Amino acid sequence: MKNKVQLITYADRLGDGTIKSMTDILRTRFDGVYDGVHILPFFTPFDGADAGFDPIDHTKVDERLGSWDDVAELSKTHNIMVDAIVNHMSWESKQFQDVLAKGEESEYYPMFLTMSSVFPNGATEEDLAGIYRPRPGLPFTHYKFAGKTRLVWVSFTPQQVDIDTDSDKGWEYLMSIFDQMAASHVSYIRLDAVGYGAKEAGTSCFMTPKTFKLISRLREEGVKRGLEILIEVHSYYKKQVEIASKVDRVYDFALPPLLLHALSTGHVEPVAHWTDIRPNNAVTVLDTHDGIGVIDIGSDQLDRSLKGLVPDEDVDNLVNTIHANTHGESQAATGAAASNLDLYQVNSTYYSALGCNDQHYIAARAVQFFLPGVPQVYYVGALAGKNDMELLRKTNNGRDINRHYYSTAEIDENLKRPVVKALNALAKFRNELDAFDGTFSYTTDDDTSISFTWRGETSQATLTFEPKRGLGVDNTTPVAMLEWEDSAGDHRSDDLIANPPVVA
Amino acid sequence: MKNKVQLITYADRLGDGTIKSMTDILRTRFDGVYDGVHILPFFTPFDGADAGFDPIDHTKVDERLGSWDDVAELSKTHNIMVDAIVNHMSWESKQFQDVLAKGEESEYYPMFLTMSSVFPNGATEEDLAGIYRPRPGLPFTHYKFAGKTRLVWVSFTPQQVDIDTDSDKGWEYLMSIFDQMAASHVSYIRLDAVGYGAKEAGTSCFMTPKTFKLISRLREEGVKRGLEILIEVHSYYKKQVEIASKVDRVYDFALPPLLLHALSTGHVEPVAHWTDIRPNNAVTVLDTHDGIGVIDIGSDQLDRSLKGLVPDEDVDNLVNTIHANTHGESQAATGAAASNLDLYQVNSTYYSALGCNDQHYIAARAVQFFLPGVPQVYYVGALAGKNDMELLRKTNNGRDINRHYYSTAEIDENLKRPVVKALNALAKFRNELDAFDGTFSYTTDDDTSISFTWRGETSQATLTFEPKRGLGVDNTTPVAMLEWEDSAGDHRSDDLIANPPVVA
Ligand SMILES: OC[C@H]1O[C@@H](O)[C@H](O)[C@@H](O)[C@@H]1O
Ligand SMILES: *[C@@H]1O[C@H](CO)[C@@H](O)[C@H](O)[C@H]1O
């Protein structure tokens, strides 16, 4: 994967509404800023039950968005990352509709998982209660197979039916996706929900030995087609570190809430500890298309004795600080549970979670860019977007608070803001200075400060992070200082917004 | 049960927001119209997960609404009906919080149902799929019993934890509810969701022989304390007919959609057929605090070969007519379109469901009042209320479209309307004429007309229903004509709105 900043975006929410328009925005307004792009599911349909993650036909681009020719065109200037939705598909797909109609007489019957598929002799309460969950309740819903009520395995929405990734039909489907991506000049594959892809009776059904076999087989299939594999693992931090050694890339989901903690309290110790133990073959982010992960730094969902990166009270305080910073907006978008420790994610834009503080935001992006891994910036974050309450009230989908539809006019309005110009300049700096392709090192005191250093062939760069220098939502004091050496000599930036870093 | 019209209301949604104010509205605005009152759950709290149906303390009135002394005061002028939420309680209850803390060491552990208490040797897919559900998804959710993750049985919201009605602690709780109602001068008890009250492995866990035993045992305890029992059962019509012989009262849940069908199509045969086979020990309604039930007249959900009162095509047409009559308002609140506990109940006010037709609405109430049983008028219906789209968009709770907050000023404004004055007078007629305490008989003229007759000691009354003479939402032609005899002789009302009936 090229060590350049990438953009994560929906083809329709950035520009006029198509892949062609999204491509135009990328080329005309973000040249040198975003050299690669992760286009969120643009298959048929992109507006179903889970904003593209419930495809009827994964191999067919939604005609309202464009064609595979548009993807092939974009590849000429940008490396493309696309999702391979390996765990499930829409109930409205031809394959599942065939099973609803014919039941056991359908050639697609072994393609889908039911309670009986995994538990043929039945299940105890322990068997079902032990299944790791990304959504509330049990992972089952009612569907009629040729008139007979069956409990189909659904990890996410009831509309997303889980496939048997080890069945002949299920595997054939996965390979059709891979073939289509390789044929359309895609460079990187994001294996969506792969952690749930293998069901093993008596286990958590998440990142188990059977899942490791699936991931290894999918990785092998990717390399023979010239595709690189990225896996997302929203879990207890140790499971993320464990699988990292077995794959090309993993997302760093621990960094986003640790920086929210650091900027809110002043403590850099958790960030220092994470820097030491974290997998370095990473894809770094602050925001994604989903909510801000809290289970990613907290204690394990199944076993409460295995503690997180920060104590349980600090995770509880992190969630309460986001709610306060957003003035209750994040509370209206996040579903209430038994405790803040039972929360999977907190729905809010990263900018709003920081109380719209420009200095804290540019600092968080700087630390993101300075830690080993290929950085990705989500489109709402690229334009330093605020919580979209208008869309949330319209759709009633919590994650829509962080999924605003940006017209070309609105993108241009936002590109005038000093924080957005600072981010574009910071991304350019990250893409141009050869220091990032060199050796990484870090120095720390106790708490207070942490300095990240990269030394390359013809350059060097050091970023100092001091959150104690400016606490509070209405702060104007810079918490990130930058020093670098290039062709023109030694340079400095004590304010990433007022004095953006430019490579000579 | 006194053969007088009763009002179904929330203590807070009729008046200033208290039991004292609700009592004042009943006495000063509805004197002689409503002689009884079903006060919807006013326990601690009334504004939780399911508008009072998730009590933390069922024996304690919510401090914001009033006290038990207020209920005792209301009893001097009105016969009171209160709910006995026998199937579940809030997770925030002192009993459940103790189980979360101590687990198996809690004295309240056998009081709550888990998957293991019903299925100790495990469960098959058929065992779990066979459990009757008003919507897809299994009746289970996760809770930690002293650190151990357990699957607690929840028939409704995940916050409403199902109790074991056969346990010693579960029965002790139910008796404390009955004792509190008896001591606070309540006359009637509505056993909410009693159909789900008994769980047995291998059965539907809904209206099974074990449930009949519970209903019978709860009835025995009611009469011993001077309380009458009304049971709420939303099911295939035959289950309502069967259980009716074992209780004091059942609701007539078939009449509300049969009248919508009769008023839209002009067909009275299904009303005639129902009049012949219906349980007469009924509590009649048009609207309730929930949505309009359609499965109450349709085919059985667990066995489609058992047909309803009207063919399944007519049930689909009934639902589509409501959607058309409400200009899509009900389509925005029903099932999948908003948050609902029942997928098939149509969320709309009865008045809006008829396209706000005054003649059809008054005719529907007239038929309701003329069929055997004690009539109940829901507060929104008492004020001929329209769909509250503003409260619906504010909460996203589907049933809120039929749960408008009426201030004293809005009540008085609605009391000026001819249709509301017509209903007030019709109910006064229903309470004052002794014909209703006498002999019931009916005649029918082949699918076009039906005449309901009551003959008492000093009077007689006949209501002719002929919906074919006035089809369409913009109808002005009366479809219910009344003839009666009293101390002053023979009288007529060929228009219940322009000439409301008044007893001499
Ligand atoms: O496909 C189901 C879920 O999988 C996750 O990996 C994606 O990031 C989510 O956006 C999606 O809702
Ligand atoms: C009885 O059943 C459920 C559960 O308490 C409640 O939501 C309804 O409002 C009531 O009719």
PDB file of C-alpha atoms in Angstrom, chain B residues 140-335:
ATOM      1  CA  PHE B 140     -34.052 -12.449  24.408  1.00  0.00           C
ATOM      2  CA  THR B 141     -31.499  -9.830  25.432  1.00  0.00           C
ATOM      3  CA  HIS B 142     -28.190  -9.716  27.327  1.00  0.00           C
ATOM      4  CA  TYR B 143     -27.822  -8.840  31.011  1.00  0.00           C
ATOM      5  CA  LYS B 144     -24.983  -9.541  33.429  1.00  0.00           C
ATOM      6  CA  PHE B 145     -25.927 -11.575  36.517  1.00  0.00           C
ATOM      7  CA  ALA B 146     -22.883 -11.003  38.779  1.00  0.00           C
ATOM      8  CA  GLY B 147     -20.509 -10.743  35.817  1.00  0.00           C
ATOM      9  CA  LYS B 148     -22.004 -13.704  33.910  1.00  0.00           C
ATOM     10  CA  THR B 149     -23.785 -12.894  30.638  1.00  0.00           C
ATOM     11  CA  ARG B 150     -27.322 -14.287  30.639  1.00  0.00           C
ATOM     12  CA  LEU B 151     -30.107 -14.285  28.067  1.00  0.00           C
ATOM     13  CA  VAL B 152     -33.145 -12.842  29.797  1.00  0.00           C
ATOM     14  CA  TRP B 153     -36.605 -13.434  28.361  1.00  0.00           C
ATOM     15  CA  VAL B 154     -38.078 -10.158  27.078  1.00  0.00           C
ATOM     16  CA  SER B 155     -41.384 -10.290  25.163  1.00  0.00           C
ATOM     17  CA  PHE B 156     -41.505  -6.544  24.512  1.00  0.00           C
ATOM     18  CA  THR B 157     -38.704  -3.918  24.799  1.00  0.00           C
ATOM     19  CA  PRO B 158     -35.278  -5.184  26.039  1.00  0.00           C
ATOM     20  CA  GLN B 159     -35.987  -3.073  29.160  1.00  0.00           C
ATOM     21  CA  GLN B 160     -39.119  -5.064  30.058  1.00  0.00           C
ATOM     22  CA  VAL B 161     -37.844  -8.205  31.772  1.00  0.00           C
ATOM     23  CA  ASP B 162     -40.279 -11.136  31.859  1.00  0.00           C
ATOM     24  CA  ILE B 163     -41.174 -12.569  35.247  1.00  0.00           C
ATOM     25  CA  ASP B 164     -41.848 -16.166  36.248  1.00  0.00           C
ATOM     26  CA  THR B 165     -45.544 -16.117  37.106  1.00  0.00           C
ATOM     27  CA  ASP B 166     -45.242 -19.652  38.551  1.00  0.00           C
ATOM     28  CA  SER B 167     -42.413 -18.827  41.004  1.00  0.00           C
ATOM     29  CA  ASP B 168     -43.013 -17.945  44.675  1.00  0.00           C
ATOM     30  CA  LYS B 169     -41.411 -14.499  44.384  1.00  0.00           C
ATOM     31  CA  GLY B 170     -43.159 -13.799  41.076  1.00  0.00           C
ATOM     32  CA  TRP B 171     -46.574 -14.620  42.534  1.00  0.00           C
ATOM     33  CA  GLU B 172     -45.822 -12.570  45.694  1.00  0.00           C
ATOM     34  CA  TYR B 173     -45.249  -9.537  43.428  1.00  0.00           C
ATOM     35  CA  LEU B 174     -48.492 -10.044  41.465  1.00  0.00           C
ATOM     36  CA  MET B 175     -50.412 -10.269  44.734  1.00  0.00           C
ATOM     37  CA  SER B 176     -48.850  -7.027  46.019  1.00  0.00           C
ATOM     38  CA  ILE B 177     -50.224  -5.321  42.867  1.00  0.00           C
ATOM     39  CA  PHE B 178     -53.719  -6.794  43.426  1.00  0.00           C
ATOM     40  CA  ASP B 179     -53.615  -5.807  47.144  1.00  0.00           C
ATOM     41  CA  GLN B 180     -52.617  -2.234  46.296  1.00  0.00           C
ATOM     42  CA  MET B 181     -55.453  -1.889  43.779  1.00  0.00           C
ATOM     43  CA  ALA B 182     -58.080  -3.315  46.178  1.00  0.00           C
ATOM     44  CA  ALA B 183     -57.009  -0.959  48.995  1.00  0.00           C
ATOM     45  CA  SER B 184     -57.053   2.079  46.691  1.00  0.00           C
ATOM     46  CA  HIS B 185     -60.716   1.584  45.690  1.00  0.00           C
ATOM     47  CA  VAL B 186     -60.098   0.287  42.132  1.00  0.00           C
ATOM     48  CA  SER B 187     -62.972  -1.791  40.720  1.00  0.00           C
ATOM     49  CA  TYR B 188     -61.608  -3.444  37.557  1.00  0.00           C
ATOM     50  CA  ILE B 189     -58.265  -5.007  36.602  1.00  0.00           C
ATOM     51  CA  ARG B 190     -56.890  -5.239  33.072  1.00  0.00           C
ATOM     52  CA  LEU B 191     -54.394  -8.106  32.836  1.00  0.00           C
ATOM     53  CA  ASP B 192     -51.926  -6.679  30.301  1.00  0.00           C
ATOM     54  CA  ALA B 193     -50.154  -9.152  27.999  1.00  0.00           C
ATOM     55  CA  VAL B 194     -51.417 -12.107  30.053  1.00  0.00           C
ATOM     56  CA  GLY B 195     -51.371 -14.204  26.869  1.00  0.00           C
ATOM     57  CA  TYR B 196     -47.542 -14.219  27.102  1.00  0.00           C
ATOM     58  CA  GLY B 197     -47.550 -14.848  30.863  1.00  0.00           C
ATOM     59  CA  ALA B 198     -46.720 -18.569  30.798  1.00  0.00           C
ATOM     60  CA  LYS B 199     -43.723 -20.149  29.119  1.00  0.00           C
ATOM     61  CA  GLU B 200     -43.442 -23.854  28.344  1.00  0.00           C
ATOM     62  CA  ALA B 201     -40.823 -25.599  26.213  1.00  0.00           C
ATOM     63  CA  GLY B 202     -42.064 -26.941  22.890  1.00  0.00           C
ATOM     64  CA  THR B 203     -45.095 -24.621  22.778  1.00  0.00           C
ATOM     65  CA  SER B 204     -45.823 -21.187  21.274  1.00  0.00           C
ATOM     66  CA  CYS B 205     -45.715 -19.672  24.817  1.00  0.00           C
ATOM     67  CA  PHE B 206     -48.903 -17.779  23.897  1.00  0.00           C
ATOM     68  CA  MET B 207     -52.435 -18.799  24.950  1.00  0.00           C
ATOM     69  CA  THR B 208     -51.413 -22.400  25.746  1.00  0.00           C
ATOM     70  CA  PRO B 209     -52.973 -24.667  28.471  1.00  0.00           C
ATOM     71  CA  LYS B 210     -50.352 -23.303  30.910  1.00  0.00           C
ATOM     72  CA  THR B 211     -51.552 -19.750  30.116  1.00  0.00           C
ATOM     73  CA  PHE B 212     -55.198 -20.754  30.752  1.00  0.00           C
ATOM     74  CA  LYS B 213     -54.165 -21.988  34.210  1.00  0.00           C
ATOM     75  CA  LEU B 214     -52.490 -18.623  34.894  1.00  0.00           C
ATOM     76  CA  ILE B 215     -55.538 -16.640  33.691  1.00  0.00           C
ATOM     77  CA  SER B 216     -57.837 -18.832  35.848  1.00  0.00           C
ATOM     78  CA  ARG B 217     -55.593 -18.532  38.940  1.00  0.00           C
ATOM     79  CA  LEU B 218     -55.332 -14.724  38.517  1.00  0.00           C
ATOM     80  CA  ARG B 219     -59.135 -14.509  38.166  1.00  0.00           C
ATOM     81  CA  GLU B 220     -59.593 -16.443  41.452  1.00  0.00           C
ATOM     82  CA  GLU B 221     -57.330 -13.935  43.209  1.00  0.00           C
ATOM     83  CA  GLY B 222     -59.196 -11.006  41.675  1.00  0.00           C
ATOM     84  CA  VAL B 223     -62.675 -12.014  42.901  1.00  0.00           C
ATOM     85  CA  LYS B 224     -61.320 -12.761  46.416  1.00  0.00           C
ATOM     86  CA  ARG B 225     -60.267  -9.088  46.627  1.00  0.00           C
ATOM     87  CA  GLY B 226     -63.444  -7.662  45.049  1.00  0.00           C
ATOM     88  CA  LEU B 227     -61.812  -6.942  41.673  1.00  0.00           C
ATOM     89  CA  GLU B 228     -63.143  -7.854  38.204  1.00  0.00           C
ATOM     90  CA  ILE B 229     -60.826  -9.253  35.516  1.00  0.00           C
ATOM     91  CA  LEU B 230     -60.484  -8.022  31.914  1.00  0.00           C
ATOM     92  CA  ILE B 231     -57.893  -9.763  29.739  1.00  0.00           C
ATOM     93  CA  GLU B 232     -56.023  -8.238  26.803  1.00  0.00           C
ATOM     94  CA  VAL B 233     -55.461 -10.814  24.052  1.00  0.00           C
ATOM     95  CA  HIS B 234     -54.430  -9.838  20.501  1.00  0.00           C
ATOM     96  CA  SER B 235     -54.643 -13.093  18.558  1.00  0.00           C
ATOM     97  CA  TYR B 236     -56.448 -15.130  15.919  1.00  0.00           C
ATOM     98  CA  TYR B 237     -60.173 -14.545  16.669  1.00  0.00           C
ATOM     99  CA  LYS B 238     -60.870 -18.153  17.756  1.00  0.00           C
ATOM    100  CA  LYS B 239     -58.467 -17.868  20.706  1.00  0.00           C
ATOM    101  CA  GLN B 240     -60.492 -14.846  21.912  1.00  0.00           C
ATOM    102  CA  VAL B 241     -63.778 -16.779  21.559  1.00  0.00           C
ATOM    103  CA  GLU B 242     -62.310 -19.791  23.435  1.00  0.00           C
ATOM    104  CA  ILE B 243     -60.870 -17.917  26.450  1.00  0.00           C
ATOM    105  CA  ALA B 244     -63.964 -15.718  26.886  1.00  0.00           C
ATOM    106  CA  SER B 245     -65.935 -18.444  28.685  1.00  0.00           C
ATOM    107  CA  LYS B 246     -63.235 -18.623  31.392  1.00  0.00           C
ATOM    108  CA  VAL B 247     -63.120 -14.894  32.297  1.00  0.00           C
ATOM    109  CA  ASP B 248     -65.390 -11.989  33.319  1.00  0.00           C
ATOM    110  CA  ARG B 249     -64.469  -9.868  30.254  1.00  0.00           C
ATOM    111  CA  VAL B 250     -62.432  -9.990  27.013  1.00  0.00           C
ATOM    112  CA  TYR B 251     -61.946  -7.105  24.591  1.00  0.00           C
ATOM    113  CA  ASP B 252     -63.734  -7.059  21.247  1.00  0.00           C
ATOM    114  CA  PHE B 253     -60.656  -6.488  19.088  1.00  0.00           C
ATOM    115  CA  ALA B 254     -62.377  -7.733  15.964  1.00  0.00           C
ATOM    116  CA  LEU B 255     -64.982  -4.946  15.753  1.00  0.00           C
ATOM    117  CA  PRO B 256     -62.582  -1.972  15.132  1.00  0.00           C
ATOM    118  CA  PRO B 257     -61.200  -3.252  11.758  1.00  0.00           C
ATOM    119  CA  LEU B 258     -64.522  -4.897  10.748  1.00  0.00           C
ATOM    120  CA  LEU B 259     -66.169  -1.467  10.948  1.00  0.00           C
ATOM    121  CA  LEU B 260     -63.404   0.190   8.873  1.00  0.00           C
ATOM    122  CA  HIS B 261     -64.053  -2.540   6.294  1.00  0.00           C
ATOM    123  CA  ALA B 262     -67.838  -2.051   6.475  1.00  0.00           C
ATOM    124  CA  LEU B 263     -67.574   1.746   6.148  1.00  0.00           C
ATOM    125  CA  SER B 264     -65.154   1.632   3.188  1.00  0.00           C
ATOM    126  CA  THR B 265     -66.805  -1.193   1.220  1.00  0.00           C
ATOM    127  CA  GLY B 266     -70.464  -1.152   2.269  1.00  0.00           C
ATOM    128  CA  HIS B 267     -70.378  -4.837   3.323  1.00  0.00           C
ATOM    129  CA  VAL B 268     -72.153  -5.674   6.616  1.00  0.00           C
ATOM    130  CA  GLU B 269     -72.039  -9.495   6.379  1.00  0.00           C
ATOM    131  CA  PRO B 270     -68.717  -9.748   8.322  1.00  0.00           C
ATOM    132  CA  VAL B 271     -70.245  -7.593  11.098  1.00  0.00           C
ATOM    133  CA  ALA B 272     -73.349  -9.840  11.047  1.00  0.00           C
ATOM    134  CA  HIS B 273     -71.242 -13.037  11.201  1.00  0.00           C
ATOM    135  CA  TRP B 274     -69.201 -11.612  14.092  1.00  0.00           C
ATOM    136  CA  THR B 275     -72.400 -10.547  15.937  1.00  0.00           C
ATOM    137  CA  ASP B 276     -73.527 -14.197  15.776  1.00  0.00           C
ATOM    138  CA  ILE B 277     -70.313 -15.841  17.076  1.00  0.00           C
ATOM    139  CA  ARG B 278     -68.640 -13.130  19.250  1.00  0.00           C
ATOM    140  CA  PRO B 279     -68.211 -13.434  23.024  1.00  0.00           C
ATOM    141  CA  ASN B 280     -70.845 -11.155  24.581  1.00  0.00           C
ATOM    142  CA  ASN B 281     -69.013 -10.729  27.900  1.00  0.00           C
ATOM    143  CA  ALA B 282     -66.975  -8.040  26.167  1.00  0.00           C
ATOM    144  CA  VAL B 283     -65.422  -4.624  26.533  1.00  0.00           C
ATOM    145  CA  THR B 284     -66.012  -2.926  23.199  1.00  0.00           C
ATOM    146  CA  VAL B 285     -63.621  -0.409  21.608  1.00  0.00           C
ATOM    147  CA  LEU B 286     -62.814   1.349  18.353  1.00  0.00           C
ATOM    148  CA  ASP B 287     -59.471   2.845  19.320  1.00  0.00           C
ATOM    149  CA  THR B 288     -57.100   1.848  22.136  1.00  0.00           C
ATOM    150  CA  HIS B 289     -53.742   3.292  23.291  1.00  0.00           C
ATOM    151  CA  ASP B 290     -52.098   0.982  20.752  1.00  0.00           C
ATOM    152  CA  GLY B 291     -52.476   0.672  17.003  1.00  0.00           C
ATOM    153  CA  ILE B 292     -55.543  -0.768  15.264  1.00  0.00           C
ATOM    154  CA  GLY B 293     -55.196  -4.553  15.274  1.00  0.00           C
ATOM    155  CA  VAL B 294     -55.659  -6.352  11.954  1.00  0.00           C
ATOM    156  CA  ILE B 295     -54.473  -9.884  12.833  1.00  0.00           C
ATOM    157  CA  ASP B 296     -57.446  -9.858  15.245  1.00  0.00           C
ATOM    158  CA  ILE B 297     -59.658 -10.547  12.175  1.00  0.00           C
ATOM    159  CA  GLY B 298     -57.137 -12.134   9.796  1.00  0.00           C
ATOM    160  CA  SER B 299     -55.763 -15.655   9.388  1.00  0.00           C
ATOM    161  CA  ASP B 300     -53.596 -17.281  12.102  1.00  0.00           C
ATOM    162  CA  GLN B 301     -49.893 -16.392  11.904  1.00  0.00           C
ATOM    163  CA  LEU B 302     -48.582 -19.815  13.010  1.00  0.00           C
ATOM    164  CA  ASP B 303     -50.989 -21.649  10.635  1.00  0.00           C
ATOM    165  CA  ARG B 304     -52.178 -19.774   7.504  1.00  0.00           C
ATOM    166  CA  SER B 305     -54.842 -22.371   6.546  1.00  0.00           C
ATOM    167  CA  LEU B 306     -57.071 -21.207   9.431  1.00  0.00           C
ATOM    168  CA  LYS B 307     -58.914 -18.246   7.863  1.00  0.00           C
ATOM    169  CA  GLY B 308     -60.173 -15.091   9.540  1.00  0.00           C
ATOM    170  CA  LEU B 309     -63.476 -13.205   9.634  1.00  0.00           C
ATOM    171  CA  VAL B 310     -62.695 -11.632   6.246  1.00  0.00           C
ATOM    172  CA  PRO B 311     -60.342 -13.052   3.534  1.00  0.00           C
ATOM    173  CA  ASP B 312     -56.641 -12.038   3.643  1.00  0.00           C
ATOM    174  CA  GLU B 313     -57.125  -9.860   0.526  1.00  0.00           C
ATOM    175  CA  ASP B 314     -59.716  -7.810   2.457  1.00  0.00           C
ATOM    176  CA  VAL B 315     -57.256  -7.371   5.364  1.00  0.00           C
ATOM    177  CA  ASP B 316     -54.610  -6.068   2.904  1.00  0.00           C
ATOM    178  CA  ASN B 317     -57.197  -3.730   1.310  1.00  0.00           C
ATOM    179  CA  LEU B 318     -58.249  -2.519   4.795  1.00  0.00           C
ATOM    180  CA  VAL B 319     -54.642  -1.589   5.649  1.00  0.00           C
ATOM    181  CA  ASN B 320     -54.189   0.105   2.235  1.00  0.00           C
ATOM    182  CA  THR B 321     -57.448   2.066   2.681  1.00  0.00           C
ATOM    183  CA  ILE B 322     -56.166   3.445   6.031  1.00  0.00           C
ATOM    184  CA  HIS B 323     -52.874   4.470   4.339  1.00  0.00           C
ATOM    185  CA  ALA B 324     -54.831   6.181   1.530  1.00  0.00           C
ATOM    186  CA  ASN B 325     -57.334   7.875   3.911  1.00  0.00           C
ATOM    187  CA  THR B 326     -54.510   9.291   6.060  1.00  0.00           C
ATOM    188  CA  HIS B 327     -52.520  10.545   2.991  1.00  0.00           C
ATOM    189  CA  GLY B 328     -49.563   8.371   4.026  1.00  0.00           C
ATOM    190  CA  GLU B 329     -49.471   9.380   7.735  1.00  0.00           C
ATOM    191  CA  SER B 330     -50.259   5.853   8.950  1.00  0.00           C
ATOM    192  CA  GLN B 331     -47.733   4.399   6.464  1.00  0.00           C
ATOM    193  CA  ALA B 332     -45.061   6.546   8.151  1.00  0.00           C
ATOM    194  CA  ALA B 333     -45.975   5.219  11.613  1.00  0.00           C
ATOM    195  CA  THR B 334     -46.867   1.542  10.949  1.00  0.00           C
ATOM    196  CA  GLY B 335     -44.494  -1.380  11.434  1.00  0.00           C
TER     197      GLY B 335
END
